[PDB]
DNA sequence: TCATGATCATAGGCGGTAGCGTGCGCCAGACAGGG
DNA sequence: CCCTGTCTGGCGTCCTCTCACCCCTATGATCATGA
């Protein structure tokens, strides 16, 4: 899930007590700055199907 | 004077030291700690109030709501202890808490809440403690054992020698908090100073000093002195105090006042320091090479350029002096960095530091804690304030603050639970002082650094962990809901609290199953100081030093009672007089020896207060005033024994029994046994079994009555008085009038505990030992328990022993026993096994317990009733049917193959809804009838006591001698009597009587409810049938008997009566031991116990001779008085002139089977007293009778030692170890036989036996030992056909477990095969 | 502890003496526990390193074996020749010192009669065939092992000797523990080994070697005393001489390393410049 | 395994395989319905870490657990160490036709024989007794013979004295240190419940009689009886293999 | 040393029945190492006669018929 | 007849808006730090 | 590249006997009672 927030002044362990928290997209130790490809160049989709998986 | 049960059989007592402090209540650790835990405790601490006031008030995530705390309260348990052990529930009490919710408004958290709500809430069930000191967790009586762990506070250890392989020792300073993050300062071989937090990555230590907002100038102001250089007209003169120059070789000629003081090439002597400080020399002259390496303290800035001349903590060169000299600075502050006095450890540490201000230090600490993430100044401040400086995540206890102030030489032992700046700076100062060479390091095993937790503190900690999980739930829910509509029982839930405390009391490493087969084993399992468990060390890792007795275990922890094996010295047992201090350390009594006189005041010393003073040894001779009769007396000063003068002593020990525990103070003649054999004797005395008729110890220590009464197996009288009705079931005491309440008229009923199962399958019985009409005093035994007799402690039985080699049947350690022992039924112990049978719920329908059973006939079903369950009383064999059970297929319960017995008790529990069959209704009618009769007899007996009170009141004041019994007895109130105390008392007794009437109504209704209701049970079970078999195991070749000194042995042959060596009177000896175990295994105490036991039986035989001839009481009085005086200055001093001619006959009725003799531990009966008591009887002086032989009938040469030894049967029997298997069941995953005895299994042909068969040339034996007999299934069916057809031959095949190895290796990416 | 236990078990022991006895006893028990813990793992590693070595031939066909001499620490002879060369096949055939007269042939198992005939003639060093110097590929031949221990005859072709060897070494691991001059006793000839000696001005024999080993040859050939002799030690005797008992024949200084010479001449300084190579440190309270 | 409570406390392997199959099915579904650009990566990291938990748990950083602190068992924890297939099931096995009891002295024995109970000798030697019964013709099938020797009628003790007679057993003390720790005797039937063991022989076992327990094994086949008579008999091993000292020293 | 001399064998089953099994099986896996049962402990594993006592005569017969 | 409340049955992996870990020890061989 | 320190992997007796313990908590759905 895509969430907008700001890292340093608001430290995470305070906000930990809630959901939305498994961990960042990383590919590495640091919380990786993610692209928003859907937001920027891929807004409206799911024409794959509505297969309603299985 | 003596109590009335002490006039039954008064034990003869040797012993010389007059006691001054009696043995305390031996179960005070458990009971006092758990009383400290659960009690309404004001002023905050300790108890549950500490947890409820440290985790509350829960305040929300800025939603202005707050759940604060009021009080708590425990209701009564729904089940008392007996119903709880029968049914199987926890013995718990519900914990009601009064919590309050307040909800603040907007723009004013300092403003008024709009609404409050205070209410009762249910959370958890904490299990209570029984009066014995034990818990009942799931019907099984368990003990939580005290833990010995490290005391919170600072600790300056020294990693000696081993590191860096160059002998340079390190020094670390572990701050041990009670709860929070650890902190280890240390050094390194480059002499830098390194901090670490919770064994994580390593940083240079001064990075935390910047984190406390210290500039570097202030740090060098703290950790070093200053050296002043004044530029006054000539070569940059110096202020010099010569104490820094103690042994330093100068680089020039130090002169002052026109006088040469110190020469170049020499050092400054101490007398040259005296010269320079006597002449008051201040300014001396230095060269240009003297300040070539002096380290500046603070920053100097040039006023013109505004730049930095030289940075702080920097050595000075020529150009730096040239820069600061022409800028206008005349004072130069440097540091003194010596080789021996003050190393520049802080200076090298600051030179390794990359950081420069507070922010960079907090960033680096935040980065070593949580690796690889963006720090922010707010996050770094929050983390470093929540490591050490917050009331939440960091808390030294009062113990921690005491050790932290004491080990830093502070004054106030009170402080906050959090650290501060001065605390860490004092840790670094003391660490640098230890590195400099002054002061000492602290050892670990010293008992001033080992605290004792107990039941209360550990249950408080587990309950606190439950509360922080529930505050992690309440903080979630409180600011994420609609307010005000909810109440504080919809928020807080009882699942984590009850789960935490139930997991601690249920399965911890210290909440262990009580070894209960003996009163001694109970009372020495409850007094145990275990080092293991959470927070302590582990068995297979550590170590060497902790398994060793430190010099400060003297009088706190017993040195000789510890389990041998893999954990010696970790499962320490606490001593006799050893209390526990206010903080948790150990303390022991002493006697304050003022300057000449031993004052009889007791005075408790801890483990560190003992070291400073000087303590006299326990048995030092003193002449009736306290004046020490010698002028050199053996004492111990600072952990080291020595010989001191008469009146430099400050304390004396109380009694000579205080080094040992209660396990190893019932050993007579302990001072004669080598310590290994005393250890094995104490451990096997714990492992005894109760016999059928326990006798007494003839040679005891007088400590038996403390272990019997101060445990919970006997029925101690609460209020004294006169016995009214004795029975094998109950005992009724009528309370004396000078001990009695005005109301609640009162005659007590003791319901004894008859034949029921212990934990070790023994038979915990209680027998009444009082007669009828007999007076009893307050604090006195009424009913003996298991292995007790008249209030004493009788573990085994005392038998006639002889030390001689007898034809090899006692070769290594074996024991040879006459048939006279087994004919008298005197080791015949009684065991009880519980066999359960559940009616589960499966497919095709539920099960059947009824006796309409297939595949069986008359011969099985004759021993069952018409509803499957065996009768009460049917003596069964091994393999009959007890409960008949058929599934939608015979699955009836059977006696396991081998054991006999007699079914004594059958329980049937029914899950509610299921149809009760006819026998469950029979048990329901039976228990209804029993409880009906019992409560009706409660009402009748207490009404009889009440009417006896009415008769006692109406003796005076309007007495009616004839008119009293003309009317019915329930109206004894409206007789002629005015308004006095007597009509008031009859009104109070009418109040009591109507209370008993309505109470009897409501309690009989509640008891019918308890019998009639069902019970909550397992998921999917109909009914549980429990059957109690009662085996009676006698004795046989193979059992283990042992004395009380370590003389073990498998009894090897049960001889006839005739073969025994007899003496020239006629009596056969009962047991023939082996003499050769004495000089190697140095337990010489058993031979003194043997001789003194023969003396005791000689006095008993003379009493039996003087009483069997029907002699008058004068001669009995004469002889009993001569046998009770007989010694040196002793403690007993009895006289029979105040026993009045009827007690003397009954005392001789109790002495005729021998005279009991007390022998205290280290103040016992010497050799000459045993000789003088063997001279009172007509026995030979040397103790040795000449003995004839039974076989040959001719005399043994060189007369042998006979006497009585008190020998114990241990419960390592031989028909519990013996096992055999031809072909049984096989395991599922690897086709090998099962393991154990209950599972019908085969013995492990282990790896070293495979090596021992490779070591011979036995090849086919090993092939069938690991292919045919064990694993290969087609191989073993071919083998079984070949054996029953007579063809001894094996078809080998392959082990199937090797195919399992192929599948497990093949299930990886590995391709293992079998070639060709 | 400097104040001993002056009381025995027949008399009493008071409290402190029994406490000190408890120090000793619990130290012993913890030693036995962790001692068993190490001993079992030692037996495991030895039977897993040997594990495989089976007596698989009957004669390798080599000569080179090890030299069995009785061990000499420097006192009494601890382990004699009969208890070392009992039952092991000789490497080179032993010739008695009636040289070119054979006493035993070179493939004779030395049982008890042969060991007594070795003790009578005082045989120096029976060079004998050891397992470590064998030649059998993938196993060990029968003659280089020796007598079948636990029996009398030679080892049978087949008995796995690695496993019995590893058990015999690791089995007494339960019993084991865990945590100025040269004084002669006997009398005989004097032997020196690996010595570079020279004559002093006093007439004695001084040594210029650390590797000097002194030996006492007895009357019949063997050695009953051996002494490691330090560097630059001074002998009161020489090589091949005869001494008596109780006579200290050597003396040195264990604190000082002597730099004694060979030729007689003046002493000068070469490459010894004062201030750098040598320093001026005057012994203050003595003078020299 | 069932624990007889309506529930299955599962083995650790089924938990590990279940985790791999959960994570793999979720990764197939996420590769199906398209991954959000730089997204089809976290799920593959999770799958790699679950397989690394299955093949060798704990070798990668912090191990997993089911309950509560103890790390659960992977495949490499079933092959390695103790409690694994090499040292617990393949080099030393549990063995049928065996028994164990407490030892005692009985000095009336010759040194090639030991006392052994009637109950142990009847339970170790069952199929021998079955064979003698249907070879002498006292039971038709095997089931009648089994019920005869369960009832212990008066004839099977003669059968048992005719099968013990020249048939060795192996006695074994539980810490076998050296190769004299397994020896072979010829049994003598004893009324009682202990193993009477010759005293001189107890120099080799390092066995006193203060509660020691020894285990008896039976050689089934014929070659094993000959090896327990010619190689391992108590009269043959009178010398130790460590030296030439006798091991029958009178104690 | 004896633990390194036992881990360095030409037979991976002996070095697997001794200490660390992971390193021995991975080295023998990537090397394609081929045990031939070579003595005592591999034959104790696989369930056949030891080549020491009576099985030594059996193994001489089996190797002679190869 | 409809709505609300209470009780019973069935269903998953730090619990939380952080931090817990802390009392083994040796050897050894690779990986890397310092120079 | 040549040491020299750190790091993380290995390993730490055998056999037997006994005992306990082996989800509870939360959410959703259905049924009953009251308005
Ligand atoms: Mg023993
Ligand atoms: Zn050879």
XYZ file of C-alpha atoms in Angstrom, chain B residues 513-711:
199
model
C 6.693 -30.515 40.685
C 6.972 -31.138 44.420
C 9.070 -34.140 45.456
C 6.615 -35.336 48.112
C 7.252 -38.749 49.574
C 8.490 -37.755 53.005
C 7.973 -34.801 55.379
C 11.691 -34.117 55.080
C 11.513 -34.019 51.293
C 8.696 -31.454 51.387
C 10.396 -29.219 53.927
C 13.730 -29.346 52.094
C 12.301 -28.891 48.617
C 10.544 -25.722 49.727
C 13.865 -24.400 51.094
C 15.922 -24.457 47.944
C 18.223 -21.837 46.488
C 18.460 -22.716 42.815
C 20.896 -20.805 40.640
C 19.254 -21.889 37.375
C 16.204 -20.568 35.580
C 15.578 -17.247 33.855
C 18.260 -14.682 34.566
C 20.799 -17.195 35.822
C 23.345 -19.592 34.386
C 22.826 -22.923 32.618
C 24.041 -26.407 33.461
C 25.784 -27.487 30.270
C 27.682 -24.186 29.902
C 28.909 -22.849 33.270
C 31.216 -23.531 34.893
C 33.978 -23.828 37.509
C 33.767 -21.120 40.170
C 30.002 -21.108 40.719
C 30.091 -24.829 41.533
C 32.373 -24.091 44.492
C 31.662 -23.072 48.070
C 32.766 -19.487 48.704
C 34.033 -18.513 52.183
C 30.819 -16.523 52.843
C 28.378 -19.415 52.683
C 29.037 -19.879 56.391
C 25.621 -19.892 57.994
C 23.580 -18.874 54.960
C 23.746 -21.687 52.405
C 24.469 -25.262 53.455
C 27.856 -26.553 52.302
C 27.117 -30.301 52.351
C 23.532 -30.708 51.094
C 23.621 -30.395 47.312
C 22.762 -32.855 44.532
C 25.744 -34.626 43.067
C 25.809 -35.057 39.323
C 25.526 -32.516 36.512
C 24.493 -29.631 38.803
C 26.523 -29.541 42.005
C 26.565 -26.190 43.749
C 23.815 -24.745 41.554
C 20.913 -26.355 43.443
C 22.162 -25.120 46.823
C 19.907 -25.555 49.845
C 19.396 -22.756 52.350
C 20.586 -23.274 55.924
C 18.623 -23.511 59.174
C 18.774 -20.086 60.808
C 19.226 -18.182 57.536
C 16.543 -15.558 57.048
C 16.240 -13.215 54.083
C 17.076 -9.516 54.460
C 14.765 -6.605 53.624
C 16.310 -6.238 50.173
C 16.726 -9.895 49.299
C 20.186 -10.829 50.501
C 20.926 -13.483 53.102
C 21.366 -12.717 56.778
C 22.150 -14.907 59.773
C 21.957 -14.463 63.551
C 24.869 -13.678 65.825
C 25.353 -12.787 69.482
C 26.757 -9.335 70.235
C 29.905 -9.964 72.258
C 30.360 -6.716 74.107
C 33.895 -6.142 75.409
C 33.912 -8.935 77.960
C 30.507 -10.613 78.071
C 28.590 -12.574 75.434
C 25.254 -10.747 75.564
C 22.298 -12.983 74.780
C 20.746 -10.579 72.242
C 20.532 -11.897 68.702
C 21.574 -9.579 65.928
C 21.203 -10.294 62.222
C 24.229 -9.776 59.990
C 24.210 -9.685 56.194
C 26.980 -10.931 53.925
C 28.977 -7.684 53.740
C 28.491 -6.610 57.346
C 30.010 -9.935 58.400
C 33.307 -9.180 56.682
C 34.210 -5.981 58.512
C 33.617 -7.382 62.006
C 35.232 -10.418 63.645
C 33.138 -13.434 64.603
C 33.923 -16.065 67.214
C 33.372 -19.701 66.338
C 30.239 -21.433 67.620
C 31.754 -23.891 70.105
C 34.112 -21.741 72.159
C 34.260 -22.561 75.849
C 32.863 -19.949 78.237
C 32.443 -20.031 82.006
C 28.851 -19.221 83.014
C 29.098 -15.442 82.501
C 30.352 -15.188 78.939
C 34.040 -14.725 79.713
C 36.035 -16.707 77.158
C 38.035 -19.212 79.156
C 40.991 -19.266 76.758
C 43.202 -16.341 75.785
C 43.479 -17.453 72.167
C 40.159 -18.167 70.464
C 39.540 -19.411 66.927
C 37.764 -16.788 64.841
C 37.467 -15.517 61.280
C 38.113 -11.948 60.233
C 37.674 -11.222 56.517
C 36.766 -14.522 54.896
C 39.881 -16.072 56.473
C 40.056 -18.205 59.606
C 42.685 -17.440 62.245
C 43.391 -17.291 65.993
C 42.554 -14.030 67.780
C 42.761 -12.605 71.272
C 40.150 -12.865 73.994
C 38.440 -9.490 73.784
C 38.943 -8.263 70.241
C 35.952 -10.392 69.200
C 32.687 -8.720 68.217
C 30.250 -11.558 67.569
C 29.709 -15.191 68.462
C 27.628 -17.726 66.565
C 24.271 -18.588 68.067
C 24.125 -22.366 67.955
C 26.391 -24.971 66.480
C 23.759 -26.279 64.030
C 23.724 -23.233 61.784
C 26.237 -24.092 59.088
C 24.130 -27.068 57.971
C 20.618 -27.364 56.522
C 17.656 -29.325 57.824
C 18.420 -32.150 55.421
C 21.835 -32.748 56.985
C 21.181 -31.874 60.604
C 19.148 -35.011 61.274
C 22.348 -37.013 60.737
C 23.750 -37.976 64.144
C 27.531 -37.779 64.458
C 27.916 -35.534 61.428
C 31.322 -34.283 62.557
C 32.799 -37.768 62.142
C 31.773 -38.295 58.505
C 33.844 -37.187 55.547
C 31.940 -34.573 53.573
C 31.294 -36.717 50.479
C 29.587 -39.397 52.543
C 27.625 -36.780 54.477
C 26.440 -35.366 51.144
C 25.304 -38.777 49.930
C 23.688 -39.456 53.301
C 21.666 -36.234 53.268
C 20.541 -36.830 49.680
C 19.426 -40.393 50.355
C 17.700 -39.287 53.542
C 15.678 -37.044 51.268
C 14.957 -40.046 48.999
C 13.338 -42.308 51.632
C 9.914 -43.970 51.494
C 7.347 -44.250 54.330
C 7.053 -47.750 55.749
C 3.928 -49.375 57.176
C 4.577 -48.689 60.875
C 7.316 -46.081 61.246
C 9.167 -46.505 64.476
C 11.504 -43.660 65.721
C 15.201 -42.854 65.549
C 17.025 -44.234 68.576
C 19.932 -41.927 67.726
C 18.510 -38.607 66.554
C 19.588 -34.997 66.791
C 16.553 -33.466 68.511
C 15.784 -31.685 65.215
C 13.015 -34.183 64.384
C 10.270 -32.233 66.131
C 11.015 -29.043 64.186
C 10.886 -30.889 60.860
C 7.706 -32.744 61.810
C 5.683 -29.945 63.422
C 6.962 -27.127 61.204
C 5.943 -29.077 58.105
